[PDB]
Amino acid sequence: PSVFLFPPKPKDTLMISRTPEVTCVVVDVSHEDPQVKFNWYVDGVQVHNAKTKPREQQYNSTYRVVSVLTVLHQNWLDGKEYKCKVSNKALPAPIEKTISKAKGQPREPQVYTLPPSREEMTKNQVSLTCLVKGFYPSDIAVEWESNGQPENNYKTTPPVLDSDGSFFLYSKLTVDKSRWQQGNVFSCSVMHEALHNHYTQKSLSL
């Protein structure tokens, strides 16, 4: 019987709108010793009931019981260590897996905007590109805006480790040629931990 802690999705931490949650999961819960008793400790103080809220589930030939605890942004972004202390009878001595954003003197993500190669103009749909480099840690979200209104045709590579011990990632927003020539202004937003107001925006036009 082994435990697994799950950090929250980025998007949900960086925004005041969402509810980011830390997830703890237990798999391989023997039919004979089905009792699992979760114990959550926030940094140090037990958050007891806090928000923990499981359910049981039959699976493989075993069980999978998942218990969830809500997290306060503030605390997370500030590194409060979150701890899961799960207990069973089959198990010998309760397992205690832990999890916190990975400490690490943050690096202010650099963000540039790059236009389509003359070459691409040859086709009926050009492609704009905004590289987001040298930031830390991975957590970060990118979104595109052509005005106040944000666009649809766009994807975002996940991050890769650079040599700096830094991070970088790209994002494409394919756009119908006309648009681009008709010199419209586009902007890719980058929300992250170190951006002064957890945000910065750049723009591409003609």
Ligand X SMILES: *[C@@H]1O[C@H](CO[C@H]2O[C@@H](C)[C@@H](O)[C@@H](O)[C@@H]2O)[C@@H](O[C@@H]2O[C@H](CO)[C@@H](O[C@@H]3O[C@H](CO[C@H]4O[C@H](CO)[C@@H](O)[C@H](O)[C@@H]4O[C@@H]4O[C@H](CO)[C@@H](O[C@H]5O[C@H](CO)[C@H](O)[C@H](O)[C@H]5O)[C@H](O)[C@H]4NC(C)=O)[C@@H](O)[C@H](O[C@H]4O[C@H](CO)[C@@H](O)[C@H](O)[C@@H]4O[C@@H]4O[C@H](CO)[C@@H](O)[C@H](O)[C@H]4NC(C)=O)[C@@H]3O)[C@H](O)[C@H]2NC(C)=O)[C@H](O)[C@H]1NC(C)=O
Ligand Y SMILES: *[C@@H]1O[C@H](CO[C@H]2O[C@@H](C)[C@@H](O)[C@@H](O)[C@@H]2O)[C@@H](O[C@@H]2O[C@H](CO)[C@@H](O[C@H]3O[C@H](CO[C@H]4O[C@H](CO)[C@@H](O)[C@H](O)[C@@H]4O[C@H]4O[C@H](CO)[C@@H](O[C@H]5O[C@H](CO)[C@H](O)[C@H](O)[C@H]5O)[C@H](O)[C@H]4NC(C)=O)[C@@H](O)[C@H](O[C@H]4O[C@H](CO)[C@@H](O)[C@H](O)[C@@H]4O[C@@H]4O[C@H](CO)[C@@H](O)[C@H](O)[C@H]4NC(C)=O)[C@@H]3O)[C@H](O)[C@H]2NC(C)=O)[C@H](O)[C@H]1NC(C)=O
Q: Which of 27, 47, 95, 99 binds ligand Y (CB under 6 A)?
A: 27
- Name which of its own copies, ligand Y, ligand X, none residue 109 binds, using a CB cut-off of 5 to 8 Å depending on partner kind: none
| Residue 77 interface partner, choices ligand X, its own copies, ligand Y, none, CB cut-off 5-8 Å depending on type | its own copies
Q: Is residue 21 within the footprint of ligand X (CB under 6 A)?
A: yes
Nearer to ligand X among residue 39 and residue 62 (C-beta):
62
Binding mask 143-182 for its own copies (x = CB under 8 A): x-x--x-x--x-xxxx-xxxx----xxx-x-x--------
- Give yes or no for residue 28 binding ligand X (CB under 6 A): yes
CA separation for the pair 58, 165 (Å, rounded) = 42
**Toward its own copies, which CB reaches closer, 81 or 120?**
120
Strand positions, DSSP E, the chain: 2-6, 21-27, 40-42, 45-46, 64-70, 82-86, 95-99, 110-111, 125-129, 132-135, 141-145, 155-156, 160-161, 167-169, 171-176, 186-191, 201-204
Check: CB of residue 73 under 8 Å from CB of residue 20: yes
